[model samples]
Target: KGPAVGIDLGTTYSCVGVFQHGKVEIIANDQGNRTTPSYVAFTDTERLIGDAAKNQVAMNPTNTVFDAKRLIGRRFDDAVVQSDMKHWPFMVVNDAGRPKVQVEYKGETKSFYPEEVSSMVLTKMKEIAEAYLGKTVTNAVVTVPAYFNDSQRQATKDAGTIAGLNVLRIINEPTAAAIAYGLDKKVGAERNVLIFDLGGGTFDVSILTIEDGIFEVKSTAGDTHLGGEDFDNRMVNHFIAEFKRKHKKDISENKRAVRRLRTACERAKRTLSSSTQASIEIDSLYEGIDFYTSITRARFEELNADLFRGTLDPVEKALRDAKLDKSQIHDIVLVGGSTRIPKIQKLLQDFFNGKELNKSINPDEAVAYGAAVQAAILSGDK
Candidate 1:
């Protein structure tokens, strides 16, 4: 038996962690990134994953497969998949009833199931863990959205298997996050906790009751397709229209230019989280023209007002399902990168009547950390 690891197989990003010396350590990839982009790309000579794949996305949009979590274990006929295809640059064809992604790799057209694409990412994570641990890692505990169906859960397990991992268990993202939070606290009276997880490509809200180190999930709800990317899209579209109105050029149909603009918009969105203003500047954006624009945090919030508000619906649903009142909830924990948005935090704070959110754990690494703890337990490590 080799070392055990925890894997957070996310929609837009993936993270790995290991338990050692009485603590969980989030492993960084060779690129020095704590979280690796969940992207895979193919070129004429080689296949690329993680940061390398993401770096070449503008030039190879049609071949870089991303957000594979949305398609894994889903059918081609699923309405959500059908709707999502409209925004994807790559080609997705129907294979019997399943969605198959086709990309040009090594001078040939290659097709892969969604799980296979996900496996490439999992393999990358495994390699990263192996590099950091200096040992063969065989056991792992992977995490998925709490709302994931049985088929999705099974597909995730298969992905780990394809990555050469034992896959000791498949845990819920929120439950894993709750474990990260509860592990350090002194065991005491029962407490209700609400986990608001809004990641790059999915949103999930879970309510759990914890007592004496035991955690029980009462309810979970969320929009599988709603997340940080949607917020980025709002900014992307806003800038696209702004560019059209200023330069009278429609770059909407230009894949490369749209990709560039989206990158800028995503950066600006992150900047707006802590600052009141951010600028978008692109040189030779279209037709040898430089584009420069600025947006205020207030305007950014207004642009995505409805989407931010829609997040609350799942929180309400989870509370309703749990049969718990808002006041009874002892703590609200924020998970996922999207939760860093001020508007989201503000909305959540207001919803709970200004209750202070738990920020003790790293939003991006908590799931993997908890998964590592579970992996340690399964591997017979105290």
Candidate 2:
């Protein structure tokens, strides 16, 4: 039968989970992946989702949209949207003041609302939930940033509705992470947690208290403009400048080439997480000019020192707002895909004076897992 599910509609990647067989299970997509890229693309004859759409970036830069979560439900005139427009390779049009993706399809140009594109990703989640459960699943609790306002939360719900989900609830990302974390703790025991969440496109530092099965957020701080995507962009721009300096040609102006370089930089960033060094080589990146670079972990850390510092401000602010010292925090939990970065772990560990950050849960799937916990509670199945 169809069961309750939780979906983390993240900025870079999304995950879907369900409460089944007396436990929470993260559902895998048709590709057998637990997480799906939050991307969509439109072509003359077909629409693509997830990895398929993400793969179209270099060949169809204007039509393949990535990280639409940053603009969804935002006005075209917003300063944030304006700032984001400068970094995007895809075209975004002003649709009566709302931001919409502009693409060409069926020999004609068209624009789609941000929610419409997000619904495409959510639709795939629903399909996976159904396929795994062997029944139609229509309800879910979605996760959002703790700092998201009324407009942003409503936009998320609207996207879920459009995907045929009941839109059961929209919970905060940090709270979801907390739920997944506190599940094993004794109900009457008091626990203080600092959730250091660094995602693909956003970062949040939250201090929370849990006792007797209740989770209360004491304070939260973050930057909507900061995350792993920014790191990728920095590396991409740096490589482009390097290529220009050596080859005497600017590939930044070429949307196709820039998209290719962007993906390559992301790969290199992930590789350096576990290794001391990583290298990237994109053959014929632009005009048959091959680009290659070897980057040491130290170099990557140096390039992103300021960006890494950016996350610390929010941590300090959250602790101050909560009126708690670093020592008072019983657990420092890392959440989000960006937390997988070793530099981030090192910084937080040093900040806590060698107190190890909690690693009991999977960073990428924790929110969705916690969301499933909430879904189960709401459905009276917990």
Candidate 3:
């Protein structure tokens, strides 16, 4: 039989995984990258997706559709979508009350629903799986945030269908994360697990209990609009303010300038993860002015300390909703790309009284790995 595969359709990035040789492996794109940016672009001549689409965001923001996950299954009048419209470069127009992305492609103007944009991303992952397995990939399991509503989950499944994939199941993101690390353990063992998932633009915490190879979610809580993006914004606002102080210019109104500043801040955030300080530089940031700045890790953390605090309320709420004390948690599993931030880890560690968080699975790939495991089980693979 062809290898069974699974997909993690993330907010900022996505991953595809398959089980082979008794192990789960991630499928890499042609660029040899394990993760693909969840982006799509429409040009006058052709359509672009993934890395290429992301690269075009700075220069052609109006043509690039990104962060579509935020609008999927949501009405254009949704408060969240309305807020996003103010910041996104691309146009968000209402199409029969649904959200649509409007762009001109090859002299033709068109609108695409969020599902269509998401399908493009999923299609690439399906192709990646097909190329790696050298066979057609038809069925797969997909992961979503535990707090996602029925409409959101339905939208995700529709995207998979549109991508030519038969989605066998839609599992909660935190439950999938638990399976990735807890799969190898012996059955009949009971454990209380807390999954703290912080992705590029969202945060979720789930309390679960696993016993006899069965996993049950006790409670879940999150803020859909919180995560690494908050930190990046904090840094972006800081830079804009600094630039205004020096040059008395507010470049925030320029989408290109804002995009460039965001990229530099994102890089700084990643750099400061492993270093004490980060130096940010961007050429021609705004109006013939170059931007350069250095931020100490201490200052960066201090500036966004409230954002870190913001995560804890959900954690507490999840625990409360589960009717369990934090002390009863046997394992604190960290999931999502943003969980790798030093400040987040430190805060979580302190909250757990210095208990070392679980690191048995790749933070970025855990959900996809777990999905692959589920796909294998569904396919009757040994």
Candidate 4:
């Protein structure tokens, strides 16, 4: 049988992993990156996905379909979609009450449903898995945020089908993290684990009880629209205002300029996670002028203070729903890239009365690692 893989199909990035040689290994894309950008771009002569698509987004903002996960299985009239559209550079038109992404592809104006865009990203992940395993991969386990509804889950399965993979299961991301965490415990150990997943575009908090080999999720809650991207947007807006004040030019309406600034801001945000401060420098930000600015980690934390604090609400709610106090939680497992933020970790630690968050698993790869483990089990691998 060909190799069965697991995929973490995130809104901003995607990762694929496989279990082999008694271990789970994340498959890197052709770019040698473990995580691929969840972006697809259609240029005049060719189509691009992953890092290639993201690299040229400034030049083809309208043609690059990204963050489609936000719109998948959601109607055009959804309040979330309506609000999210304001920040998207690409156009989203209502098609018979459905959200359709409009783009110019293949010398024609084409419109794709969000599922189709997601399917393309899934296909790229399938390709990466196949390349790494040196076989035709047909079976996969995909992970979704715990708060995803039935329609959204079905839409994800449909996307997998379009990508030509047999979706073995649609597991909750937090549960997958728990599975990955549970595998390390002794066979008969029982413990309550809280999964705090804050990714690029979504947040999820789940409480689970793992006993022996059984994993049961007791509660789950999250803000689908809250994540690292929101943090970046805050910085982007701050800089946009700074540029307007200094240069007297509002680049907010300039798609290319805004895209460039947002990209720089995202990098800076990541930088601030490990450094005290980060600098943003952009050339020709507007009308042959450059822009330069820097932000201290203190200011970055202050800017997103509310959002960071908001993450704790779901944690508290999840604990309450599980009918367990934070003290009763045996371990807090951190998931998603956003959890790397020192401020977020500090807040979580304080909330748990100084308990150390489990960072043993790679946040970016944990979900996929667990998915791959599930895939291996389903494939009857020894």
Candidate 3 scores a C-alpha RMSD against the true structure in Å of: 2.5
In candidate 2, stretches whose alpha carbon ends up further than 4 angstroms from where it belongs are 73-79, 82-102, 183-186, 241-250, 289-293
State candidate 3's TM-score.
0.90
**Distance from true position, residue 33, model 2, in Å?**
3.2
Error of 3 at 372 (Å): 2.0
Report lDDT (Cα) of residue 118, candidate 4: 90
Residue-wise C-alpha lDDT for candidate 1, range 166-224, written one tens digit per residue? 99999988878877776435477888889999988888899988887677789988887
Off by over 4 Å in 1: 75-87, 94-96, 183-189
lDDT for each residue of candidate 4 in 238-334, tens digit (9 for 90 to 100): 9899999999889988878888899888889889978998999898988989988899999888989999999999998898899989998887889
TM-score of each: 0.91, 0.87, 0.90, 0.89
lDDT of 4 at 77: 95
What is the overall TM-score of model 2 with all chains considered together? 0.87
Q: What is the lDDT, from 0 to 100, of the residue 32 in candidate 1?
A: 95
lDDT comparison, 3 vs 4, better candidate: 4
Over 1-382, each residue of candidate 3 has an lDDT whose tens digit, in order, gives 5766889888888998998788999999877888888999888888888888887787777898888888888898899899999978889999989999898888788888888888899999998899888999988888887777898889999998999888889998787888888643547667889999888888889998888777788999888779887898999999899999988999989978998898898879878988988988988889989988889888888889999978989989999999988888888888876787788999998888888988667788889988998899888884
Name the weakest run of 10 consecutive residues (lDDT summed) in model 1.
Answer: 178-187
lDDT of each candidate versus the true structure: 0.88, 0.84, 0.86, 0.88
